[PDB]
Structures are given as structure tokens and as C-alpha cells.
Amino acid sequence: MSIGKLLSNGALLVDVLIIGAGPAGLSTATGLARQLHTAVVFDSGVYRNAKTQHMHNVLGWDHRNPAELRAAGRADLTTRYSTIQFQNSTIEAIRQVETNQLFEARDNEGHSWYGRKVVLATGVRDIPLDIEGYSECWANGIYHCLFCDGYEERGQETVGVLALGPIANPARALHLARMALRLSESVTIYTNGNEQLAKEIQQAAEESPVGASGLKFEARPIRRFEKGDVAKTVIVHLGESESKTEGFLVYNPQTEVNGPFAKQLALNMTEGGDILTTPPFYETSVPGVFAVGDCATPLKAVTPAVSMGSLAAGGLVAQLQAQAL
Amino acid sequence: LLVDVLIIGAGPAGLSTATGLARQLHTAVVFDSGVYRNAKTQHMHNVLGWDHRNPAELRAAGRADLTTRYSTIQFQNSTIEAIRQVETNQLFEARDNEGHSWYGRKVVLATGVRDIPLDIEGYSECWANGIYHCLFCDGYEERGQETVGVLALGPIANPARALHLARMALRLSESVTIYTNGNEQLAKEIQQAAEESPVGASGLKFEARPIRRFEKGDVAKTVIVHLGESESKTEGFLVYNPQTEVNGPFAKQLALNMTEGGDILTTPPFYETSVPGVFAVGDCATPLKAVTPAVSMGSLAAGGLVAQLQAQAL
Ligand SMILES: Cc1cc2nc3c(=O)[nH]c(=O)nc-3n(C[C@H](O)[C@H](O)[C@H](O)COP(=O)(O)OP(=O)(O)OC[C@H]3O[C@@H](n4cnc5c(N)ncnc54)[C@H](O)[C@@H]3O)c2cc1C
Numbered sequence: 001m002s003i004g005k006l007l008s009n010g011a012l013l014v015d016v017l018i019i020g021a022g023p024a025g026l027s028t029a030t031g032l033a034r035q036l037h038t039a040v041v042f043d044s045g046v047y048r049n050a051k052t053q054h055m056h057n058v059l060g061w062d063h064r065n066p067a068e069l070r071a072a073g074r075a076d077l078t079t080r081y082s083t084i085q086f087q088n089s090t091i092e093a094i095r096q097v098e099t100n101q102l103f104e105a106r107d108n109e110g111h112s113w114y115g116r117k118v119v120l121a122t123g124v125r126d127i128p129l130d131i132e133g134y135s136e137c138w139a140n141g142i143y144h145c146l147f148c149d150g151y152e153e154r155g156q157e158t159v160g161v162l163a164l165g166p167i168a169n170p171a172r173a174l175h176l177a178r179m180a181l182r183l184s185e186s187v188t189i190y191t192n193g194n195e196q197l198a199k200e201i202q203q204a205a206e207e208s209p210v211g212a213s214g215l216k217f218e219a220r221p222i223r224r225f226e227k228g229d230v231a232k233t234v235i236v237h238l239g240e241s242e243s244k245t246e247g248f249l250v251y252n253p254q255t256e257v258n259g260p261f262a263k264q265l266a267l268n269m270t271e272g273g274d275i276l277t278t279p280p281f282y283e284t285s286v287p288g289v290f291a292v293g294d295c296a297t298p299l300k301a302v303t304p305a306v307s308m309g310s311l312a313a314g315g316l317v318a319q320l321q322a323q324a325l
Numbered sequence: 326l327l328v329d330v331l332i333i334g335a336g337p338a339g340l341s342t343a344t345g346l347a348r349q350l351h352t353a354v355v356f357d358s359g360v361y362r363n364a365k366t367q368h369m370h371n372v373l374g375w376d377h378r379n380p381a382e383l384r385a386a387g388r389a390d391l392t393t394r395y396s397t398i399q400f401q402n403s404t405i406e407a408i409r410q411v412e413t414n415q416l417f418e419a420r421d422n423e424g425h426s427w428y429g430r431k432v433v434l435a436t437g438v439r440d441i442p443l444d445i446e447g448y449s450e451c452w453a454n455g456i457y458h459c460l461f462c463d464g465y466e467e468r469g470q471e472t473v474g475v476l477a478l479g480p481i482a483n484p485a486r487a488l489h490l491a492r493m494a495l496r497l498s499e500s501v502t503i504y505t506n507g508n509e510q511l512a513k514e515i516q517q518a519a520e521e522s523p524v525g526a527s528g529l530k531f532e533a534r535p536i537r538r539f540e541k542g543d544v545a546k547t548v549i550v551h552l553g554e555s556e557s558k559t560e561g562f563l564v565y566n567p568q569t570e571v572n573g574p575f576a577k578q579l580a581l582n583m584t585e586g587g588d589i590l591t592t593p594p595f596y597e598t599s600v601p602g603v604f605a606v607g608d609c610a611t612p613l614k615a616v617t618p619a620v621s622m623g624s625l626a627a628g629g630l631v632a633q634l635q636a637q638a639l
């Protein structure tokens with residue numbers, strides 16, 4: 001290579017291997033660059049929000065393409081700084097060769113990279129509902145985050161909430177339905193064949209201080225989703241032969257962390273599949289390995305991802321400067 | 326005038342909070358007295374997508390985004406003098422410097438902090454101009470020094486803080502002198518801690534003489550530190566993270582729990598204060614005083630506000 005310190009195997013050793021060039025990884029690299037620390041940032045080119053044209057709820061970046069944030073971040077990292085190296089390849093394996101001290105990353109081309117520390121910023125993959133038409137409607141009628149979307153489609157007569165998967169409880173369903181009520185006159189909560197749940201959600205709503213006004217409950221099984229002709233509408237085909245048109249649908253899917261690294265490094269995971277990290281610096285259960293962004297928090301958004309990246313760099317700088325080379 | 330949220334502050338923290346609320350069509354009045362902690366700076370660093378940009382540009386973009394595409398966020402360029410609760414979590418009243426009152430279901434305090442100067446002649450002249458508080462914020466621009474100083478005074482007067490800063494300053498300078506302003510016991514403790522640490526004390530010097538005054542040098546960001554009676558040392562720049570105090574009387578008026586540093590005590594995931602319905606975000610509510618945490622706090626605060634407004638009666 002051309003940056004870092006030589007090892008006995010013939011390779012150069014950088015301070016940090018950052019696996020990910022979304023906002024989380026780019027923000028981590030941003031902090032390191034301030035203190036002249038070296039990093040190889042890997043990018044497989046798989047971004048969770050690749051299906052979108054417009055970012056929201058990111059201060060100063062309203063309605064901008066998420067690709068623009070990544071481009072600005074990359075430009076900022078190579079223009080006034082020269083310690084940050086970008087590698088467009090997919091990491092297939094990571095191993096700790098020395099405790100907290102040396103890590104090896106191997107890519108899809110057979111090439112090896114060495115860092116004193118590792119940052120996992122691989123993001124997550126959204127798991128589709130096994131229902132016909134779901135894939136056509138995802139991020140195009142079915143929305144997961146009403147801070148991220150929904151405002152553009154406000155003023156509806158009726159929209160739906162899918163109380164399925166992780167939304168199949170009164171807390172999540174009601175929180176999402178009440179958010180949807182800001183955007184629609186009426187909200188129908190779909191339970192896909194769970195009457196008991198529909199009853200639980202209704203009762204919880206009726207028994208809550210604000211009540212159940214504006215809410216509809218649909219317990220019938222869902223046969224398929226059809227992308228309606230107009231705007232972001234989705235026709236939900238229920239039972240044998242009835243259907244209903246909704247302005248759009250709200251569903252926050254189950255996710256899984258991208259890459260095999262939690263398995264390979266035996267990193268503690270959350271019940272939800274996320275890599276378990278602890279504030280203040282978001283170090284994982286193996287020292288010297290950090291995790292930031294979607295792969296390491298239930299707060300899966302751009303501003304928390306960038307914040308995690310900054311704080312991780314603070315911790316990395318501390319470790320790099322306090323620990324013998 | 327009753328809105329959902331009275332937001333006191335239009336820095337990154339307040340603006341981020343408003344950005345969140347606007348997505349869900351919640352109403353807010355954002356107050357701005359026009360006093361920003363980084364008012365003295367031309368170049369913001371360590372904020373993804375904004376390297377070397379003017380911090381005023383971030384505030385301008387955040388304001389423009391909110392006024393352009395959203396209609397539920399109001400801005401008031403006035404100073405708030407007093408806030409009080411009218412009914413428990415039900416209602417808050419903010420009184421401005423013109424004797425107008427505003428009512429909100431909730432309140433966000435995003436007032437920032439004021440950096441307390443050292444009581445040493447010449448400090449004021451050298452602040453953010455030779456004396457730097459955050460080596461992620463600055464320092465990189467003045468790299469390649471022969472010598473720089475760390476002021477191990479106030480909150481930096483302990484081996485951990487002094488060594489952490491000194492090792493950061495060593496990235497930017499051949500040598501770092503740690504000043505203890507007359508505390509010889511501290512100088513020795515810092516040296517031993519460095520000497521006994523895994524990385525050692527190489528590149529560090531220790532200066533325990535009392536500091537009489539700071540004189541800003543004519544060249545670049547240099548500061549002449551006047552020691553003893555007549556002796557002096559010229560540094561490339563000095564590094565010191567000051568004690569801070571929250572802006573505004575609101576933590577006192579509402580009797581909000583404070584941290585041991587004087588910040589408003591808040592807790593993730595939503596940064597609500599010790600008084601239900603009052604939130605605090607950004608510098609006034611965290612020891613992590615930087616733009617990206619301030620912005621993230623604003624977003625999460627908006628999530629908690631959104632949750633309460635929609636689960637509680639109007
Ligand atoms: C449809 C949709 C819309 C959204 N809209 C918004 C919005 O408006 N506002 C908002 O704040 N949030 C939004 N989000 C959430 C947002 O996308 C995430 O919070 C954010 O992208 C997380 O950033 P990250 O860096 O953690 O992961 P990502 O941005 O997904 O980046 C992951 C990086 O890791 C890399 N990677 C993964 N595995 C490997 C490997 N083995 N080797 C090398 N590289 C690897 C990828 O190539 C990629 O570069 C949206 C999400 C979705 C699905």
C-alpha cells in the first residue's frame with residue numbers, strides 16, 4: 001500500500017478499517033481525519049435507502065438525494081484530508097490476529113487489509129413480508145418511517161397500518177396509527193388474520209387518554225397488495241373477494257445486519273439482530289471493534305448514524321493515542 | 326397563541342427538533358435571540374457534508390428548509406425571559422422581552438452554553454484565536470507546530486483530561502507543554518501517569534509556574550504565555566476546554582435537575598428533562614458539545630415530543 005506502518009508479513013497497517021461508506025462510516029472517517037489518523041473505508045455499494053430520491057429529517061438536507069450526502073462526505077474526506085483511503089470492494093471476512101491490537105479484513109478479490117481497529121458500519125437489509133405484491137409496493141406505497149416519508153402524501157381520506165411482524169402489538173401499531181392520523185382522515189389497522197390482536201389494539205386505544213377516534217380495525221387475512229394506479233395508493237386484497245384502497249400503507253419491517261462479521265467475531269447481538277454497542281463510543285463486545293449506524297442501533301436514521309460515527313471516532317482516537325503501536 | 330411546542334433556540338439543536346416536528350405537521354414557535362456559541366468562527370469541522378463551511382450556513386439552510394416546504398413551524402426573533410407551567414404537563418407559557426406571551430403543550434430548551442473565561446489577563450483576546458477548546462473542531466488547520474500548550478486548569482486540571490488533550494495536540498505539534506498554573510503536585514501526577522502509561526511521556530513537557538497573562542503573538546495563532554515574574558514561553562497555540570454555563574434562566578425557573586457540570590440533565594432515548602413535557606437538546610443538555618450530537622438529539626427529542634403529543638389529550 002502507501003499509508004500506514006509496516007508489518008512483518010509485508011503489508012502496511014492503518015489505524016482503522018471502516019466497513020461501510022454510508023453516513024455512519026463516512027462520519028467515523030470524518031472524525032479520524034481531523035486527528036490525522038489513517039483509515040481504509042470499504043464500500044460494497046449497497047445502501048439501505050437506494051430506492052429513494054429524497055432524504056428528510058436531516059438538518060440542512062431536506063428533500064435532497066441521499067447519494068448527494070455520500071458524495072459530499074467522500075469529497076470532504078479527500079479534498080482537505082489525505083489519510084482516508086477508499087476501497088470499492090466487499091469484505092468477506094474479518095479476524096482479530098491480536099487482542100484489541102490487530103485486525104485483518106479479506107475482500108472478495110482475495111486481498112488482505114490490516115488495521116489497529118475495526119468499525120462495522122454495514123447497515124441493515126429490510127426483510128420483505130411474504131405477501132404477493134409487497135416488493136412492488138415497498139418504498140412505493142408502503143412506508144416504514146413517517147419522519148422519513150409520509151408528509152409528501154398528506155391529506156389522505158384513508159391510509160393503512162400493517163400490524164404484522166414486529167408491528168403486531170398494541171404499542172407499535174397504535175404509535176404508527178396515531179402518526180398516520182396526522183396525514184389521513186382515517187387509519188385502518190390491518191392484522192392479517194389476528195382478531196385477538198385487533199381487539200387488543202382497539203381496547204388499548206379506547207382505554208387510552210386520547211381514545212380511538214379515527215381508527216378502523218381490519219382483522220381479515222391479506223391475500224395480496226396491488227400497487228394502485230394513482231400516486232402512492234395500495235389496494236389491499238382481503239379475504240376471498242373483497243379489497244380496499246388505501247392512500248398508502250405504513251409498515252416497519254424486521255431487519256438484519258449486512259455481512260457475516262457479528263458471527264465471525266462472535267459479537268453480542270440484540271434480540272432484534274443489531275450489533276450490541278454501548279454509549280459513549282459504541283464499542284462492541286470485542287474491544288477494538290466498534291459498530292455504528294443502522295447495524296448497531298434501533299434508532300435507524302441518518303442523524304443518529306452520523307452522531308454515532310462522530311462519537312465512535314472520539315473513542316477510536318482515544319484508544320489509538322493511549323495504546324502502544 | 327397555542328402551539329404544540331415552544332422551542333427556545335434556533336441553533337442546530339433547536340432547528341433539528343423543529344425539522345422533526347414539521348414532518349408530522351406539529352406546530353411550533355422557534356425563538357432565536359441570535360446568540361450562538363460558535364458565533365466567532367468562520368469554519369465548521371467534523372460535521373458530515375459540511376467540512377470547512379460557515380456554521381451560519383447550516384443555520385440558514387435549516388431555516389430555509391423549514392420555511393420553504395413546511396408551514397407549521399413559526400420563527401420568532403426575540404429573547405425569552407421566563408417560562409412557567411400553567412397546568413401540569415398540560416400547558417407552558419413563555420414570556421419574551423417585549424411582554425408577549427406564547428403558550429405550548431410542550432417546551433424544548435435548546436439555548437446552548439456560554440464558555441466561561443479564565444480570570445487571567447489576555448485570555449479574552451486569545452479565545453478562539455490562539456486558544457482552542459476542541460481538537461475535532463479546530464487544530465488540524467494549525468498543524469505542524471514546533472510547540473503548543475495545554476492549559477491543565479479548571480476542568481482540565483486532572484491527569485486524564487490533560488493527557489487526553491496533550492496526546493491530541495501531539496498529532497499537531499512536535500512538542501506539547503502542559504501548563505498547571507502553580508500546581509506542582511498536578512504537574513508531577515500528570516508526568517507520572519504519562520511515564521507509567523503504555524505509550525509513555527515522549528514529546529511532553531510540564532510547566533508548573535503560575536501564569537501572569539496571555540499575550541497574543543503577532544505571528545499566526547501564537548500565544549506568549551507569561552510565566553513567573555519575567556519569564557515567558559511562546560506557543561503555536563493553546564488548548565483549553567472551558568467550564569460552561571447554560572444560557573437562560575429556565576433550568577432555575579422550572580427547577581430542572583442539573584448535571585455536575587451545570588448542564589440540564591436529560592436521558593435518552595428522547596432527552597426529556599426532570600419535568601414532564603420539558604425537553605432539552607444540544608449543548609445545554611449534554612457534555613457532548615458538538616454539532617452532530619446536537620442535531621441527533623434534536624431528531625430524537627422530536628420523536629419523543631411526537632409520541633407525547635399524540636398520546637395525550639389536547
Ligand atoms: C426507503 C428508505 C427511506 C429512508 N429515508 C430516510 C430519510 O429520509 N431520512 C433518514 O434520516 N433516514 C432514512 N432512512 C434510513 C437510512 O437509510 C439509514 O438510517 C442510513 O442509511 C444508515 O446509514 P449506515 O451508514 O448505517 O448504512 P447505509 O447507509 O445502508 O450504508 C451501509 C454501507 O455499508 C457497506 N457494506 C455493507 N456490507 C459490506 C461488506 N461486506 N463490505 C463492504 N461494504 C459493506 C455498504 O456498501 C454501504 O456502503 C431510510 C431507509 C429506507 C429503507
Ligand SMILES: Cc1cc2nc3c(=O)[nH]c(=O)nc-3n(C[C@H](O)[C@H](O)[C@H](O)COP(=O)(O)OP(=O)(O)OC[C@H]3O[C@@H](n4cnc5c(N)ncnc54)[C@H](O)[C@@H]3O)c2cc1C
Pocket residue numbers: 333334335336337338339356357358359360361362363365366368369370371372403404405406435436437438440453461462463572573606607608609614615616617619
Ligand atoms: C469557537 C467554537 C468553535 C466550534 N467549532 C465547532 C465545529 O467545528 N464543529 C462542531 O461540531 N462544533 C463546534 N463547536 C460547538 C458548537 O458550537 C455547538 O455544539 C453547537 O453550536 C450547539 O448547538 P445548540 O443549538 O445546542 O446551541 P447554539 O448553536 O449555541 O444555539 C443556541 C440558540 O439558543 C438561543 N437562545 C439562547 N437563549 C435564549 C433565550 N433566552 N431566548 C431565545 N433564544 C435563546 C440562541 O439565540 C441560539 O439561537 C464550536 C464551539 C465554539 C465555541
